[PDB]
């Protein structure tokens, strides 16, 4: 599923991401835009052989099991395919664990390079939240 901007903001808000660990909703919408273009089915393979899955491009080296990332962990205790569903609940629950791991949203390269420091609240302007 390809979310609309306000559609995703509203789903994310409903799942408790607004101000989660101090990150306002716009940060999460911005990260999702640049990680996946709001597409829950986005996958991208990394040169180490791990793969990033879903709307927040969660990586199989630590966070989910795809059966093909040898020596990897499964810290969200989920098949990576669960991160591709049209229902974002699994991606959100796992992202809450990631952002708690010490480095905050810097664990998302696109957020650090394209969202961090910018006027992120623009990503939720005009939405009925």
């Amino acid at each position: 599923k390809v979310f609309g901007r306000c559609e995703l903001a509203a789903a994310m808000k409903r799942h408790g991401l607004d101000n989660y660990r101090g990150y306002s909703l716009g940060n999460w919408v911005c990260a999702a835009k640049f990680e996946s273009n709001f597409n829950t089915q986005a996958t991208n393979r990394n040169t180490d052989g791990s793969t990033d899955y879903g709307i927040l491009q969660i990586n199989s080296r630590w966070w989910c099991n795809d059966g093909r990332t040898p020596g990897s962990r499964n810290l969200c205790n989920i098949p990576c395919s669960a991160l591709l569903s049209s229902d974002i609940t699994a991606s959100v629950n796992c992202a809450k664990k990631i952002v708690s791991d010490g480095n905050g949203m810097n664990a998302w390269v696109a957020w650090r390079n394209r969202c961090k420091g910018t006027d992120v609240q623009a990503w939720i302007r005009g939405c009925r939240l």
Side-chain angles (χ1 to χ4, degrees), residues 1-4 7 37-42 55 84-88:
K1 172 182 172 161
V2 181
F3 277 80
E7 185 185 13
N37 206 22
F38 298 149
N39 186 0
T40 68
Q41 301 197 66
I55 209 177
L84 303 179
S85 171
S86 60
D87 169 353
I88 56 74

Side-chain angles (χ1 to χ4, degrees), residues 56-68:
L56 290 167
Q57 288 293 273
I58 291 171
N59 182 263
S60 62
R61 213 169 208 191
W62 320 97
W63 305 107
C64 62
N65 196 11
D66 64 1
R68 72 169 191 190

Side-chain angles (χ1 to χ4, degrees), residues 3-126:
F3 277 80
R5 175 175 66 80
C6 301
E7 185 185 13
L8 178 63
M12 265 178 176
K13 194 213 184 83
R14 201 232 314 180
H15 283 92
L17 278 189
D18 191 18
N19 304 299
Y20 191 86
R21 277 321 208 281
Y23 294 88
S24 62
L25 200 58
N27 282 283
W28 296 102
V29 174
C30 185
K33 175 61 177 198
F34 291 128
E35 291 291 348
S36 73
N37 206 22
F38 298 149
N39 186 0
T40 68
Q41 301 197 66
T43 63
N44 285 106
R45 173 144 218 200
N46 307 119
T47 202
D48 69 350
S50 67
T51 303
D52 294 346
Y53 296 82
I55 209 177
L56 290 167
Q57 288 293 273
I58 291 171
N59 182 263
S60 62
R61 213 169 208 191
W62 320 97
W63 305 107
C64 62
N65 196 11
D66 64 1
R68 72 169 191 190
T69 309
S72 76
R73 298 145 91 111
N74 188 344
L75 289 188
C76 294
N77 307 300
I78 55 148
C80 301
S81 60
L83 300 169
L84 303 179
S85 171
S86 60
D87 169 353
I88 56 74
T89 301
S91 278
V92 166
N93 288 341
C94 188
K96 288 187 171 158
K97 302 222 172 253
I98 298 172
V99 75
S100 296
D101 195 42
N103 303 291
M105 293 193 66
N106 296 291
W108 286 275
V109 59
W111 178 83
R112 180 155 67 62
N113 288 333
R114 310 188 58 184
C115 297
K116 187 161 181 190
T118 63
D119 186 19
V120 292
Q121 260 41 84
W123 291 100
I124 59 167
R125 298 209 200 320

